[PDB]
Amino acid sequence: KVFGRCELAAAMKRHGLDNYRGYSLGNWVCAAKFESNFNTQATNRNTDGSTDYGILQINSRWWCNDGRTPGSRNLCNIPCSALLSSDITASVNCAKKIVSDGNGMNAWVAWRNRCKGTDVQAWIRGCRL
Ligand code: NA
């Protein structure tokens, strides 16, 4: 599923991402925009052999299990395929774990390089939230 901007914002808010760890909803929408283009099925292989999965491109080295990342942890205790569902619940729960790990949303390279410090409120403009 490819979410619309306001649809994803509303789903993220319902799942409790708005202001989670102090990151406004727009930060999460922006991160999903630049990580996956709002596509829940986005997968991207990294050179170290891990893969990023889903709307928030959660990595298989630490957070999910994909059975093909030797030496990997599965801290969200979830199959990586579950981060590709049209229902983003699993991705959000895992992102909550990720953003609490120490470096906040800097865990997402696209958020740090394309969202951090920008007018992230633009990402929720016009949404009935
Ligand atoms: Na893993």
Cα–Cα dist 51/81, whole Å: 11
Q: Domains plus CATH for the chain?
A: 1-129 (1.10.530.10)
Is 52 catalytic? The answer is yes
Distance from the CA of 19 to the center of ligand 1, in angstroms?
Answer: 27
Resolution, rounded to a tenth of an Å? 2.3
Q: How far is CA 49 from CA 18, 70, 79, 98, in A?
A: 32, 8, 16, 20
Decide: 30 and 115 in contact? Cβ < 8 Å.
Answer: yes
| Cα torsion angle, 27, 29, 34, 40, sign | positive
* CA neighbor of 128 nearest in space, from 3, 1, 5, 2: 5
Tell how far the Cα of 45 is from the centroid of ligand 1, in angstroms.
Answer: 13
From the candidates 48, 52, 66, 119, give the one annotated as an active-site residue: 52
> Which residue reads 């649809």 in tokens?
7
119 is catalytic: no
- Experimental approach taken: electron diffraction
A 10 A CB-CB count for 64 gives: 29
CA of 68 to the centre of ligand 1 (A): 8
